[PDB]
Design a protein around this ligand. Structure first.
Ligand code: HEC
Ligand code: MSS
Lengths: 83, 363
């Protein structure tokens, strides 16, 4: 309920590199065209969380970001994907 | 379906994402060749626009690492030689679902949950790289790899080596490598990397560079992310690193493709596809009881070469019930599919015979 806006901040500003630069997410007015358009992927929180933790392709294994943050972004994305 | 692939067959394909389309198991057919409008799609980054197909023959290709470096156009490549080859195009991810099936407890893995449809068999046509290299004086002394670079225009604001699709394979492949401008008798499509495609026979999809804009003979592998740490075979919980094996040579594989779901009791023709990667498939066995009993299958259609798949088939006579259809391939040097493939963190190269079993209700 509250931890969403944190995910959104993580998604648009706080992340390095920013998710929005690679991803498309309608809710965030993100138009990143390199990784999957996340509205089409409509991934669950667990999928997001693992991707950002373990890394995938050009996403590296997370190192400069704590777990409360990861779960925030995992909650935000999974929720808003294809609203 | 996504626009740049609006022409493809929506019913034949699972849309995992706009970057990621898998062929349904029932759609392969029994001709070997995969209908172009059903061939799978896997793109690591953004896609170029159609405008690069406006002038196919003017598309340029910088060839360095040769005694006489030159940028060539497709027009000039067409003059230097002609080669045609049938190969299996198959992502390293094909089968990732089956690795996810084996994760216990906390163990978690990312990536497209491909089953078997990130694979097709196609006939490429174009110029061989050996011709193009010998045209330019031969390779520079001590070249050890063929390194090709994707033509995508990378979006500004990020480090190029993080996103460029640039792969290196050993120079032992020069004899087999092809810069194809044509697929299955048609000008190469945008989806499949027209107007020009490096094709490395026997190797995973990642190594077949769509819209190749440079091709270099190099003493070292490229340091691009996609080569250094991605597409590497490591243990669960490990990170990818350039000492680990990369996804190069494809291993022996097969799956059942027909019948896919239901069948009447009696004679039933069970078929699928099989290949040995770098080698021809020598033989295939099928089981209807999921491993307990094996019978030798029959090859169907012609032999399109060592890097192509064969169709095989078995005539079985079946009583009513739920069967479990599985295939097990041996290539020409005697390599057999294991029951299940050793786990790896990224989930590449799945080639187990149990995981992709088909469930057949004979009614
Ligand atoms: C450019 C460097 C990116 C950054 C910044 C972010 N993502 Fe990403 N992501 C990118 C690509 C090219 C891909 C596809 C890679 C592949 O091999 O398919 C992805 C993938 C994802 C996924 C899907 C994960 C899966 O299991 O398949 C998710 C859920 C995802 N990315 C989320 C995500 C988040 C939350 C980011 C900010 C923390 C982020 N990505 C950044 C490219 C890039
Ligand atoms: N340029 C380029 N190329 C390229 C890419 C991209 O993204 N880009 N992808 C890869 C991969 S990775 Mo995995 O290993 S598979 C694969 C392939 C696919 O193809 P299609 O789509 O045609 O099918 O391609 C290849 N190539």
């Amino acid at each position: 309920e509250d931890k969403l806006a944190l995910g959104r901040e993580i998604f648009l500003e706080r992340s390095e590199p920013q998710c929005a630069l690679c991803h498309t997410l309608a809710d965030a007015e993100a138009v990143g065209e390199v990784g999957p358009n996340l509205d089409e992927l409509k991934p669950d929180a667990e999928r997001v969380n693992t991707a950002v933790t373990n890394g995938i392709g050009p996403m590296p294994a997370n190192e400069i970001l704590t777990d409360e943050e990861i779960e925030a972004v995992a909650l935000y994305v999974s929720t808003v994907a294809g609203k | 379906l996504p626009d740049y692939v609006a022409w493809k067959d929506a019913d034949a394909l699972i849309v995992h994402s706009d970057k990621t389309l898998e062929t349904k198991r029932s759609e392969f057919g029994t001709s070997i060749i995969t209908p172009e409008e059903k061939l799978y799609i896997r793109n690591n980054v953004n896609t170029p626009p159609e405008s690069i197909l406006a002038d196919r023959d003017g598309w340029k290709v910088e060839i360095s690492g040769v005694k006489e470096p030159r940028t060539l156009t497709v027009a000039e490549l067409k003059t230097l030689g002609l080669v045609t080859a049938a190969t299996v195009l198959q992502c390293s991810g094909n089968g990732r679902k089956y690795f996810k099936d084996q994760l216990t407890g906390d163990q978690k893995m990312s990536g497209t949950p491909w089953t078997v449809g990130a694979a097709g068999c196609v006939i490429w046509s174009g110029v061989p790289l050996k011709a193009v290299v010998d045209a330019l004086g031969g390779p520079a002394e001590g070249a050890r790899f063929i390194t090709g670079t994707g033509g995508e225009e990378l979006p500004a604001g990020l480090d190029p080596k993080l996103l460029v699709v640039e792969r290196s394979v050993p120079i032992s492949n020069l004899d087999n490598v092809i810069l194809a401008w044509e697929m299955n008798g048609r000008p190469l499509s945008l989806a499949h990397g027209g107007p020009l495609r490096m094709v490395v026979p026997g190797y995973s999809g990642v190594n077949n560079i769509k819209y190749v804009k440079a091709v270099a003979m190099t003493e070292v592998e490229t340091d691009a992310k996609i080569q250094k740490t991605s597409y590497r075979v490591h243990a669960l919980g490990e990170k990818g690193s350039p000492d680990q094996p990369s996804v190069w040579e494809q291993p022996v594989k097969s799956w059942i493709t027909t019948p896919h779901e239901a069948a009447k009791a009696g004679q039933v023709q069970i078929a699928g596809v099989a290949f040995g990667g770098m080698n021809a498939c020598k033989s295939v066995e099928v089981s209807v009881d999921g491993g307990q009993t094996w019978q030798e299958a029959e090859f169907i259609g012609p032999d399109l070469g060592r890097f192509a798949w064969r169709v095989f088939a078995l005539s079985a006579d079946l009583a009513r019930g739920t069967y479990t259809l599985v295939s097990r391939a041996t290539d020409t040097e005697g390599n057999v599919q294991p029951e299940e493939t050793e786990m790896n963190g990224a989930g590449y190269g799945h080639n187990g015979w149990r995981a992709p079993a088909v469930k057949l209700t004979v009614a």
